[PDB]
Design an enzyme around this catalytic site. Structure first.
Site: not given
Ligand SMILES: *S(=O)(=O)CCCCCCCCCCCCCCCC
Length: 309
Positions: A154, A251, A281
């Protein structure tokens, strides 16, 4: 369709309140990162951490030396994902292990500075300066100068791609390969790729979440087309390191990745791009939990392996 475990991940995720980006802060969101389930840490010969004293800041680095690889070692300077706001050396530790172990390369995970404490282009300067610092010490790390790659997921893929462009402009250091995992390589906001709207919701990385990241990272509207933020807009992509790009079917950045592959190929750069049909993603972070993500990440590492062979 969608990978079974990924499906269960989204179900658990959609059970939670709809995010409130108008009031979410970087600190609050960094906490939410603890929601990611425990994952398996593949074994490597050695894990070492050290400081890189750069002008204005000291960046931490976690070096992973895989088992059974003889020096000079090929290397991968890796930049973790997290929208330029979250993530660190621990969040992507399992990812780095797989890349080192199956990639058969020494991985250097860089703890670059995060926004909003450090707005654009701090991360970018960190990615580049970190690569310079490590390459400069090829000898001290028993690395093969000719086999040093840059990569990331990402926002991390974004940093790797931009770092490549900067190394080209600055005459170095030499980058043998580009490993870009569902990278945010940019695009002209006035003409978004189809996947931006298609996968805008319900697949972990959402349109709103990206908007939130952009607000934390960028300083102004105009930076949306800045090459250091959208490398695909850089005027001359030729001569960039050969690349491998992985994209996920669900994604929003799917076609963004395709856009960069297309752009690189048009500039005469050798590029391979693979779309993982049932993943979202950030699938690398579900390595060892999701069957699709596990095979995909291992495959990505083997792509890296062949690249630096
Ligand atoms: S890029 O760098 O633009 C994408 C970045 C990803 C950011 C993700 C933020 C995620 C918060 C996620 C909470 C996830 C919980 C997962 C488990 C749930 C069963």
């Amino acid at each position: 369709p969608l990978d079974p475990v990924i499906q269960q991940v989204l179900d658990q995720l959609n059970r939670m309140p709809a995010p409130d980006y108008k009031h979410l802060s970087a600190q609050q969101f960094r906490s939410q990162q603890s929601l990611f389930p425990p994952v398996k840490k593949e074994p490597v010969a050695e894990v070492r951490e050290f400081d890189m004293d750069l002008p204005g800041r000291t960046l931490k680095v976690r070096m992973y030396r895989p088992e059974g690889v003889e020096p000079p070692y090929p290397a991968l300077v890796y930049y973790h994902g997290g929208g330029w706001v979250v993530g660190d050396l621990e969040t992507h530790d399992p990812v780095c292990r797989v890349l080192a172990k199956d990639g058969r390369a020494v991985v250097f995970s860089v703890d670059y500075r995060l926004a909003p404490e450090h707005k654009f282009p701090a991360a970018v300067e960190d990615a580049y300066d970190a690569l310079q610092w490590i390459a400069e010490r090829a000898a001290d790390f028993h690395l093969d100068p000719a086999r040093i790659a840059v990569g990331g997921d990402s926002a991390g893929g974004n940093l790797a791609a931009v770092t490549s462009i900067l190394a080209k402009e600055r005459g170095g250091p030499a980058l043998a390969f580009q490993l870009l995992i569902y990278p945010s390589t940019g695009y002209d906001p006035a003409h978004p790729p189809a996947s931006i709207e298609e996968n805008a919701e319900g697949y972990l990385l959402t349109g709103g979440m990206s908007l939130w990241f952009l607000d934390q990272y960028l300083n102004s509207l105009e930076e949306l087309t800045h090459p250091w933020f959208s490398p695909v807009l850089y005027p001359d992509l030729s001569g960039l390191p050969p690349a491998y790009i992985a994209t996920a079917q669900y994604d929003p950045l799917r076609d963004v990745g395709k856009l960069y592959a297309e752009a690189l190929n048009k500039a005469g750069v050798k590029v391979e791009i693979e779309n993982f049909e049932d993943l979202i993603h950030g699938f690398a972070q579900f390595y060892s939990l999701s069957p699709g993500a596990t095979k995909a990440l291992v495959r990505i590492a083997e792509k890296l392996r062949d690249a630096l062979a």
